[PDB]
Ligand binder design. Structure first.
Ligand SMILES: *[C@@H]1O[C@H](CO[C@@H]2O[C@@H](C)[C@@H](O)[C@@H](O)[C@@H]2O)[C@@H](O[C@@H]2O[C@H](CO)[C@@H](O[C@@H]3O[C@H](CO[C@H]4O[C@H](CO)[C@@H](O)[C@H](O)[C@@H]4O[C@@H]4O[C@H](CO)[C@@H](O)[C@H](O)[C@H]4NC(C)=O)[C@@H](O)[C@H](O[C@H]4O[C@H](CO)[C@@H](O)[C@H](O)[C@@H]4O[C@@H]4O[C@H](CO)[C@@H](O)[C@H](O)[C@H]4NC(C)=O)[C@@H]3O)[C@H](O)[C@H]2NC(C)=O)[C@H](O)[C@H]1NC(C)=O
Ligand SMILES: *[C@@H]1O[C@H](CO[C@@H]2O[C@@H](C)[C@@H](O)[C@@H](O)[C@@H]2O)[C@@H](O[C@@H]2O[C@H](CO)[C@@H](O[C@@H]3O[C@H](CO[C@H]4O[C@H](CO)[C@@H](O)[C@H](O)[C@@H]4O[C@@H]4O[C@H](CO)[C@@H](O)[C@H](O)[C@H]4NC(C)=O)[C@@H](O)[C@H](O[C@H]4O[C@H](CO)[C@@H](O)[C@H](O)[C@@H]4O[C@@H]4O[C@H](CO)[C@@H](O)[C@H](O)[C@H]4NC(C)=O)[C@@H]3O)[C@H](O)[C@H]2NC(C)=O)[C@H](O)[C@H]1NC(C)=O
Lengths: 207, 208
């Protein structure tokens, strides 16, 4: 019958005041015969009631997927509270329960380095601006590129990857018209992470 | 009833002739009643009898997992032959057929650039030498580091990531004693990819 997956909030959403983090409870394999799904949510054992239920999503294997979204308080999540989704459905012998909470372990501060494009790339029309973020723990992090206080269009950040020492690193690749780089514009890598002062730092790069 | 997952060879294995590439057919959710599985393998529709099967192994959810491994010839994979695994089990209405082949699509040549450590990282006892490989397709690739013609093995390489324009990129980070960098040693990044001339390119870096 149905199965349940419980997902943590987006890293950026738990670190920034402008964002509202969410805990997401997904029920798959809901059969067309028993479509009513019931959610009960608990923060550290105490039932809460601010959850919302998305439009049901039909799937191509002839099943529904039903999703309940629970907004959480930033500091609750960062302090280690446990979030419990309990799912009831007539297609289940017993209700299913899943619990999620912040990843544990000694936090460690990202080191952020910006690297200009290789000289050998200078023959091309577009060049690559590189942000190396290493040494951090846990792996939840967010990395962006901006110029003149506005976010950039053409950049990609690799998923974090485990390093030798049990910390994580990643790279972010910003693709930029060589003209923009040559005029002298300043470009900025912004890193958001729970172990930074104010959850935020920024490093800049120009010619 | 059983499900089947069919896995391609490891990228490095398809490119180096010192390595033996393999396709792996994994069957999970095999019940205690009906525990016997038969595998049939086809290369371009033609049945081969080459596969080697791993004894069934019980999981902690009471089901079995059974694995068939087929050795593949580097050139057949590179040329796009289709490998078909057919799984027969009594707990199944009809056998399950799964097929895999090299990723189709216009190959594109990797651009390889090496990047020295940040100015600001030189304050540390170990520095990162970066190797950026971008613009390549398909995703199968291999990356290594050498100095003075011997392997440097203190590196991590990210999985390929998909870019906007359909090409892939990755980064490889080699960590060295700052002393070794400052002493002017030459380090090199070796990339192996089907769209490079002779499937190989190499790019070096040294302190200016
Ligand atoms: C019918 O179809 C539905 C829908 O699937 C869709 O339709 C079909 C027809 C196909 O086309 C599908 O390809 C298509 O996607 C099927 O539903 C799928 O069911 C599987 C399980 O059967 C679920 O797998 C789990 O996936 C999570 C990751 O889920 C994220 O990433 C998916 C892409 O990889 C994405 O599809 C999901 O939507 C989800 O995306 C996230 O969504 C949240 C909330 O919206 C969002 O905040 C995130 O940003 C977003 N992220 C991304 C990247 O998009 C994965 O975590 C699970 O892995 C566990 O279980 C595996 C075994 O199943 C095991 O291999 C893993 O290692 C891992 O194991 C766990 O390990 C932990 C610790 O390591 C351990 O504590 C646990 O014990 C262990 N748990 C185990 C073993 O269960 C898992 O892979 C799909 O998410 C789900 N798809 C969707 C869209 O919901 C359905 O199964 C089909 N029915 C039948 C009968 O076939
Ligand atoms: C009973 O238990 C077994 C054993 O599980 C183990 O024990 C239990 C108790 C749990 O604790 C588990 O956590 C624990 O692992 C269960 O068997 C599992 O079954 C699931 C399916 O439910 C399989 O999931 C698939 O996994 C592959 C990835 O598989 C690799 O990675 C796993 C770790 O992530 C690893 O465990 C696997 O062994 C396997 O490892 C690879 O092995 C090969 C061969 O040797 C090797 O060459 C590789 O190097 C190696 N790789 C790694 C990383 O180590 C994943 O790709 C599948 O994803 C597809 O399906 C999902 C839906 O299930 C969907 O969400 C995904 O998006 C993706 O969907 C596909 O999407 C593409 C397009 O993107 C589309 O073209 C496809 O059509 C579409 N396919 C589908 C089906 O939608 C999938 O997640 C586990 O691999 C398997 N584990 C093992 C060890 O065999 C069993 O499920 C349990 N049964 C019950 C009832 O509980």
């Amino acid at each position: 019958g149905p199965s349940v997956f419980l997902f943590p909030p987006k890293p950026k959403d738990t670190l920034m005041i402008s964002r509202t983090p969410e805990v997401t409870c997904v029920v798959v394999d809901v059969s067309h015969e028993d479509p009513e799904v019931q959610f009960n949510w608990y923060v550290d054992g105490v039932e809460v009631h601010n959850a919302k239920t998305k439009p049901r999503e039909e799937q191509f294997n002839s099943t529904f997927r039903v999703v309940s979204v629970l907004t959480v308080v930033h500091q609750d999540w960062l302090n280690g509270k446990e979030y419990k989704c309990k799912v009831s459905n007539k297609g289940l012998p017993a209700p299913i329960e899943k619990t999620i909470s912040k990843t544990k372990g000694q936090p460690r501060e990202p080191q952020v380095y910006t690297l200009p494009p290789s000289r050998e790339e200078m023959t091309k029309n577009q060049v690559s601006l590189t942000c190396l973020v290493k040494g951090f723990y846990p792996s939840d992090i967010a990395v962006e590129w901006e110029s003149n206080g506005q976010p950039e269009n053409n950049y990609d950040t690799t998923p974090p990857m485990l390093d030798s020492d049990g910390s994580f690193f990643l790279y972010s690749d910003l693709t930029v018209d060589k003209s923009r780089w040559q005029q002298g514009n300043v470009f900025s890598c912004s890193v958001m992470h729970e172990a930074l002062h104010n959850h935020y730092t920024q490093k800049s790069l120009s010619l």
